[PDB]
Design a protein around this ligand. Structure first.
Ligand SMILES: *[C@@H]1O[C@H](CO)[C@@H](O[C@@H]2O[C@H](CO)[C@@H](O[C@@H]3O[C@H](CO[C@H]4O[C@H](CO)[C@@H](O)[C@H](O)[C@@H]4O[C@@H]4O[C@H](CO)[C@@H](O)[C@H](O)[C@H]4NC(C)=O)[C@@H](O)[C@H](O[C@@H]4O[C@H](CO)[C@@H](O)[C@H](O)[C@@H]4O)[C@@H]3O)[C@H](O)[C@H]2NC(C)=O)[C@H](O)[C@H]1NC(C)=O
Ligand SMILES: *[C@@H]1O[C@H](CO)[C@@H](O[C@@H]2O[C@H](CO)[C@@H](O[C@@H]3O[C@H](CO[C@H]4O[C@H](CO)[C@@H](O)[C@H](O)[C@@H]4O[C@@H]4O[C@H](CO)[C@@H](O)[C@H](O)[C@H]4NC(C)=O)[C@@H](O)[C@H](O[C@H]4O[C@H](CO)[C@@H](O)[C@H](O)[C@@H]4O)[C@@H]3O)[C@H](O)[C@H]2NC(C)=O)[C@H](O)[C@H]1NC(C)=O
Ligand SMILES: *[C@@H]1O[C@H](CO)[C@@H](O[C@@H]2O[C@H](CO)[C@@H](O[C@H]3O[C@H](CO[C@H]4O[C@H](CO)[C@@H](O)[C@H](O)[C@@H]4O[C@@H]4O[C@H](CO)[C@@H](O)[C@H](O)[C@H]4NC(C)=O)[C@@H](O)[C@H](O[C@@H]4O[C@H](CO)[C@@H](O)[C@H](O)[C@@H]4O)[C@@H]3O)[C@H](O)[C@H]2NC(C)=O)[C@H](O)[C@H]1NC(C)=O
Ligand code: CA
Ligand code: CA
Ligand code: CA
Ligand code: CA
Lengths: 197, 197, 197, 197
């Protein structure tokens, strides 16, 4: 396989609500088997995408149904805020990154061309701080249609009115697959850097 | 108008790998603050559930998440193997007693209409002994989607490969809430007279 | 606040490795302040407990920690081997008399319903002689989780590898409080009729 | 297996509430069989860790469960307050050193990059004295998620209400494995210095 892993969630044991510097360097780790929760690190991700790449997102719900989304993908440098560039969607999970959510349209929930934010480095399009409330570092707009770095709620369906400190859909979510009130069981991001050509 | 406690786990201080006699009579104790581990006794459950009842199950993981399930409940007599009869699920934990584990399939993992089995009194649907392997007395099929009388593994996530003497998923489990290789921190079962609600 | 003392250990001055006759009659003495080593006598225990009683057990280790356990207690007649009947545990020492050792299981280490055995009158559940080897008269099963009449080792922790003639865990022990290889510094047993307090 | 032992507890007989000077030189003793309670000494720890090392933590609770944690580890010099630097968690006990306590908050209970403190030498991040209250010398933040040098409470489960002088969770603890209110039975820390390749 020419793919390499850049992110994975599988049991909620790792905290994803971290600082700019943790997202920049990478945290967590994977094993021999390739099991474990982690984030590769925005600085190495910038470097790995220099010559272009294909991103593959794999999702799994609490009943074992699966879906995937593939995109052409680039991550900008730290001066560009690690901005996201994606195009050419293909898959079964639905295009949450370019089109955002059907309920509230692209304008506010599209992720394409957004910078990365964290709770201590806000570069989103909201008057408030998305990352603080949604719980992870991500490419926020105002604020999201998808967030694989959100809070791990076990079981699937969750009632946001039951969350604290914020009564919001801050779970591990991909709207066009299971909706904003459904937190996913296992998720991973993998890229194929187009190193030759 | 209130509930009666019929089982509780919270620290693994009590061994639940017990005989048919221990499960018929009851073992364990609660202190006046309601703490401790126990099993009320199948003879007593048959008695209290004779006109029908509502069962409530309350589950807690090692990160503070909680969920519950409610059913209409009745246990059969001794000569009927204290067989379980449940219906009318409602809740947040997911229905592991009637639909069982969608992934493994209801034919093998549903608990409804199953007799109770212990290691010295096997009436499950497996050619082998479920209670022996899974570690406690329960309403086994072949073998389980849930088991609140399983082995208390401290800390939550466990790897069956490390278990001895059987390398299997025999923790305190409720598959539709936390999966099969996560053992819960605190669990309790409570009932109420059908009339009194 | 009147309890009658029935047993006490505190300085190892008294031999507890004695015959059926001596355990039936009683041996040892107390001073004016309630100090000294002693065993009241099983014939008196049957008599005083005929209508039920509350038993209180007090334990003290060599670092100053203390724990207690309370039970409803009865002893049978001589022809019944002065068998132990206990229920309704309450306390902080853990229930070593009814539930036994969490690790070894209730089947072999439970003391409830056992006969009292001495080296000259073995009625335990072992093919060998528990009382010979564990050093005192007790309500042995196969053989124990608790024994307040075992060997008084100095200082707490001991190594059975170092014991003669039997390399075994035969100290003054209460497994759920301090384990099997820690012998306790002071212990006592006391009773009172249910009515009072 | 090129491991050195650097700490070990097994029955609570050695007092761990000591001075900066005792922690710097080392205290306690081990017999030939590698048995005994002791602390190697921060000055010698700094020397053995100059080229990096692997730290192995081994834990045992009062019902026979065991867990371990491995980290890359280094301890700074005395001028740097013997600061802790760990990375690369793997294991089964959960990462209490880098993630801190999920419930109380990582910010306050994470141990990475903290300095060593003792009751007579406070460099913790609290306005009060962590070492004085929690009972031992340790790499305190405000104050802890783990502390193998805490007060030894017999039996496992303890009630903070019953502690004195202070009513807190100051037992021998590793929160992601057994929680803050359960004191462990046997614990050890061992290193493998990377003398290298
Ligand atoms: C680990 O090991 C360390 C080091 O040994 C321990 O740290 C010490 O813990 C002590 C426990 O909290 C801590 O507190 C001291 O308490 C003293 C009080 O003791 C009695 O007497 C004083 C006054 O006498 C009183 O205030 C206390 O309440 C208590 O009882 C009082 O006693 C007086 C005596 O007549 C009575 O009049 C009062 O009525 C009575 N009151 C009550 C409510 O009972 C303090 O005196 C002591 O202060 C010290 O003494 C002077 C006070 O200014 C000063 O010269 C000293 O520098 C210092 O202030 C203190 O408050 C000790 O201070 C801790 N010592 C150190 C070096 O840190 C840990 O407890 C151990 N950890 C664990 C987990 O076990
Ligand atoms: C609580 O009190 C109980 C009652 O006192 C104690 O129980 C008693 O426990 C002892 C120890 O096991 C038993 O001892 C009996 O006496 C002899 C003990 O064995 C020694 O002696 C024989 C032969 O003499 C020998 O083969 C053994 O090897 C051993 O020592 C040997 O001694 C010889 C010299 O004789 C020497 O040359 C050898 O080198 C040496 N061996 C070694 C390795 O050094 C046995 O002979 C006894 O066997 C039977 O014989 C007698 C009856 O005819 C009688 O002694 C025994 O009852 C037995 O039938 C036996 O070993 C006692 O049997 C036992 N008594 C009872 C009533 O149970 C108990 O120990 C104590 N508990 C605690 C914790 O302190
Ligand atoms: C991902 O992690 C981040 C990094 O940790 C977490 O973000 C952090 O989130 C906290 C919590 O929301 C931010 O602090 C907030 O709380 C304080 C106080 O909270 C409580 O008190 C205040 C009033 O004191 C209330 O506004 C809150 O609702 C809470 O309830 C109150 O509690 C009081 C006790 O303090 C009590 O007396 C009062 O009655 C009670 N009221 C109610 C209704 O319960 C807020 O004060 C704080 O606002 C701050 O104001 C300061 C100046 O006033 C500023 O300096 C602070 O920066 C901030 O503006 C804020 O609402 C914390 O700021 C934030 N940290 C960062 C770096 O962003 C994040 O939550 C995690 N997300 C998930 C999903 O986990
Ligand atoms: Ca903003
Ligand atoms: Ca079978
Ligand atoms: Ca026998
Ligand atoms: Ca301080």
């Amino acid at each position: 396989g020419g793919w390499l892993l850049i992110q994975q969630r599988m049991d909620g044991s790792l905290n994803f609500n971290r600082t700019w510097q943790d997202y920049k360097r990478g945290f967590g780790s994977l094993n021999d088997e390739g099991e474990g929760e982690f984030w590769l690190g925005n600085d190495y991700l910038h470097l790995l995408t220099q010559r272009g790449s294909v991103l593959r997102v794999e999702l799994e719900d609490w009943a074992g149904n699966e879906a995937y989304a593939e995109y052409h993908f680039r991550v900008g440098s730290e001066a560009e805020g690690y901005a996201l560039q994606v195009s050419s969607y293909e898959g079964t999970a639905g295009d949450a990154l370019i089109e955002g959510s059907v309920e509230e349209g692209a304008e506010y929930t599209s992720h394409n061309n957004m910078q990365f934010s964290t709770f201590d480095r806000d570069a989103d399009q909201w008057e408030e701080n998305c990352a603080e409330v949604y719980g992870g570092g991500w490419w926020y707009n105002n604020c999201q249609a998808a967030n694989l770095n959100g809070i791990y709620y076990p079981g699937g369906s969750y009632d946001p009115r039951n969350n604290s400190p914020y009564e919001i859909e801050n779970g591990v979510v991909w709207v066009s697959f299971r909706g904003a009130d459904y937190s996913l069981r296992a998720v991973r991001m993998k890229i194929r850097p187009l190193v030759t050509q």
